[PDB]
Assembly symmetry: C3
Homo-oligomer: 106 residues x 3
Amino acid sequence: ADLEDNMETLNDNLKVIEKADNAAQVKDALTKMRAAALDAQKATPPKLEDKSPDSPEMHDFRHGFDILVGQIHDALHLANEGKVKEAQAAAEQLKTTCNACHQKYR
Amino acid sequence: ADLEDNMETLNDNLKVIEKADNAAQVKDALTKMRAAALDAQKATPPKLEDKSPDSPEMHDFRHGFDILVGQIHDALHLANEGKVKEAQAAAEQLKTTCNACHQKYR
Amino acid sequence: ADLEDNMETLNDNLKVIEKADNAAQVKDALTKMRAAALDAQKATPPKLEDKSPDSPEMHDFRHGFDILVGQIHDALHLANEGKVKEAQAAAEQLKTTCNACHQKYR
Ligand code: HEM
Ligand code: HEM
Ligand code: HEM
Ligand code: NI
Ligand code: NI
Ligand code: NI
Ligand code: NI
Ligand code: NI
């Protein structure tokens, strides 16, 4: 999928979590966020159309997604153990990664 | 172990999974693939004998293994929850990482 | 927290594990090591005060923590499955990461 729909997938599933009743709703959204993250990681973003895929910026751009994926996973472990509010807490924490990549590349 | 035996460990365990009966067979092979991945990640590969360990290429070379290890882990979670065919599906997906590193460094 | 207290958190929890009775003691320390690792990863270390945050060295410095976090996680999985001595074995293995970052940046 395109960078922009993956960002809507990231954004949407975030709302799904912060309002979720239960663990399965959380696990499902995190699963979907992981997929989107990983697929957005393949894209070249507007701001960086002038850079080769092995530029330092494209490298750093792809690293922002590694960080998000690691976090999602840590949230997933909490979801997997039925800890729905701390899972929700994690999901909320992801924001500072979202915003760190956005400050520099969006 | 040497880069080349680790690649045979990666390759072999891949066949073990795609033909596995059960979860324990999958978990075991993934465990072994993780080990080999991590050990191959220390090696300097023929194509890159002329580069320092902190060259951008050696950096990128080691990143190909981070991606594989993350994927293996995601497959492991599926194996750990008794999902043997989707675990098998994951293991198959790893191929595009194997081949992405190979296109550029093999 | 500061780089140096996070390193004491890393160091302390390591002793907690290698002497632990049970899985919950291990899971708790690993959880805390993950937190500290991730927080130390934001710091700029003395040796690198003269480098921009996107220098290759600051990049490599932050990667040393990715490796530690991945390992901690692998130890956590063992802890989570009640495997207290192999969890302890993992925790001990972390040392070569600790020391690899230290050789070059401490
Ligand atoms: C869960 C955390 C994240 C959320 C909730 C999120 C959400 C969004 C949203 C809603 C947009 C605008 C989409 C649109 O309507 O066009 C966007 C754009 C963007 N994001 Fe994210 N994002 C996240 C993580 C990241 C990360 C980690 C990176 C960098 C590694 C990143 C890089 C970008 C870029 C480059 C755009 C603009 C692309 C363009 O100009 O077409 N995002 N994000
Ligand atoms: C599970 C995925 C992978 C599989 C199944 C796999 C399998 C193999 C096999 C069968 C070989 C030839 C071994 C021989 O008979 O000598 C090989 C070579 C090689 N692979 Fe992989 N590999 C994988 C992942 C990777 C990754 C991620 C990288 C890079 C990060 C990589 C880098 C290399 C290199 C450099 C060689 C050639 C080394 C030499 O010339 O001695 N491989 N791989
Ligand atoms: C679990 C593994 C680790 C342990 C047990 C550990 C432990 C320690 C300890 C005890 C200190 C001295 C603290 C003090 O009394 O001031 C220290 C310093 C330091 N470590 Fe670690 N560490 C680990 C991992 C890492 C990693 C992965 C990195 C690099 C990525 C790193 C980078 C540094 C640096 C730069 C200092 C010195 C900071 C300064 O000069 O203020 N450490 N570590
Ligand atoms: Ni796509
Ligand atoms: Ni990197
Ligand atoms: Ni996990
Ligand atoms: Ni070896
Ligand atoms: Ni701090």
